[PDB]
Symmetry: C8
Subunit: 86 residues, 8 copies
Amino acid sequence: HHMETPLDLLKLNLDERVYIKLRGARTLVGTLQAFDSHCNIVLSDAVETIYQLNNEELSESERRCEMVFIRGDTVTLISTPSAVEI
Amino acid sequence: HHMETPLDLLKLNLDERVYIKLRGARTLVGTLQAFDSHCNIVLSDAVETIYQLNNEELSESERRCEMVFIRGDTVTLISTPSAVEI
Amino acid sequence: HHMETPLDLLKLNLDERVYIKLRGARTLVGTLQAFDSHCNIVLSDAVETIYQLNNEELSESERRCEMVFIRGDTVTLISTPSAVEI
Amino acid sequence: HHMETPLDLLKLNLDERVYIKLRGARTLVGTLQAFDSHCNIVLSDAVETIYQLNNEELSESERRCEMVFIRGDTVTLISTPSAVEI
Amino acid sequence: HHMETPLDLLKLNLDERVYIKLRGARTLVGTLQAFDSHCNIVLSDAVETIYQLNNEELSESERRCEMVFIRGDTVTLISTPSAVEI
Amino acid sequence: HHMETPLDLLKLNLDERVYIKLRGARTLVGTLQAFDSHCNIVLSDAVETIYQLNNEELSESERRCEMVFIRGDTVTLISTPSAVEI
Amino acid sequence: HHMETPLDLLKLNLDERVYIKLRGARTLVGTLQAFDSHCNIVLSDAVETIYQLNNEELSESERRCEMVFIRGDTVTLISTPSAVEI
Amino acid sequence: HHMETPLDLLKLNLDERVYIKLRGARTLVGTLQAFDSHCNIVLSDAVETIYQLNNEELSESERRCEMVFIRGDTVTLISTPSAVEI
């Protein structure tokens, strides 16, 4: 078994598509550009998810931007992106 | 790959339009003037979003101001821009 | 670009009218007299907003006082005060 | 402009009537006797506000006491005064 | 004006009846026997208030004991005990 | 007056019956065996109170055990005793 | 009276059946294998309790596993396991 | 009895299937690749559980990904395994 820290393994994602979940299950998708030890993260080509309310209709949408700085202590998961029917 | 911290990349926005999302999805827009390591922020030419309630009608509006100091531990995202139907 | 910290830029408001939002969107308005690094603030000529309940009628009012000491960690925003119709 | 800390200005209230607002808008009134850097406070001649419930009737009253120690991290505001219809 | 700290003034209550309010407005009454700098407190001849539920009937009662050790960070107020009608 | 800390007075209960109230008014009873400065506690001959739900019927019961370790930052009160109708 | 710390007394449970309650009253049962000073715990032969929802029917079940690592700051109680009718 | 820390025993799972429970009972399954002392974790071959809402129908599903970084202070349990009806 290798001896790589969690942060060491996260390096493997630099410049790859990454999917980020924050407090209360809010999601972002983007290219991992940077991170630090508190886990602040910067994505490029990001897609933020926007939750919406109009009466009871909690619909949901996408906000696209060049670059997003995510404050570290709201991050809960960083995952890599996500065929026969018998 | 380059070796810039999250905060290093955030410098790239100094004096640019920046969109800020706080705890519970409150938003501000403005020119990034200043920031520090706790992530306290200052915007100039800011537009704060104002939520309102009158009966069930949670309408919503825009409060424009010369300068805004945003206390760092309410910030969740700082993004580059994504105003008028012609 | 200047090299002024967030707190440095806040100095620019000393003795100016300032609008302060606290936890859960409670507002105060007043003349900035003092602040420290934890962000305790003193206003003079302050106007606190008072939220009221009588049945469902969440009305709202103004409490005027000579001087207000605001405990730092409840502060979320400090902004400067806030014409043709085509 | 003068160079007094928030806490320096709070000294100006020693031995004066002072109105205190806690977490969730509970109030006290009293003479400021003492304070420290965590903002623990002592008032003498205090009047605590007492909220009550009997069915839906959230009435409200006044508990008068010689001296009150207010634990500092529940304080949100300390204000100078703003009792009887004649 | 004297130069007594909040804790210094609390000493004045040693062996006196004292009324204590905790997080969420729970009350105790008793003789102040001890306290430390975190504000742990010991009362003797204490009367705790007991809140009760039976259907909607949130009634309320008194639990009397020789001695109570109160964990410091739940304490919000310590007050001294609380006549003509024109 | 004597000069004992809260924790000094709590020693007086070692090996005595002690009643403990946690966050949100959960109770335990038992012999005080041990404690430390974070207020972690150990009781022997303990009786934990068990709350139950079946439809609306929030009934309540007793779980008896040889020894119980109570994590210190859930403790709010430790009291000396105040079981059977004959 | 012995001079054993809370953690010292917990040692007495190594390799014994132990019942663990976490934040919000979630329960686990198992053989105590390890613990550290932050109170991380490892059980073997564990039985986790699984709470379930299907309409209003908050039923409840058991998930059995070889070994469970419990993160320290969610632990609230560790107790030892729990006859004539007059 | 042996003298292994909780974290020492957690090593035994490196490269094994591991089931993880977060705050509020969100689950992940995957191969343990890495961990650190705050308990940040990395799994490979992970299966995140995805909760969904459409009217009242809180259905539930599986998001499969190459690698997942789980921020340590959301982890509550890490367990060894307990998929198909034939």
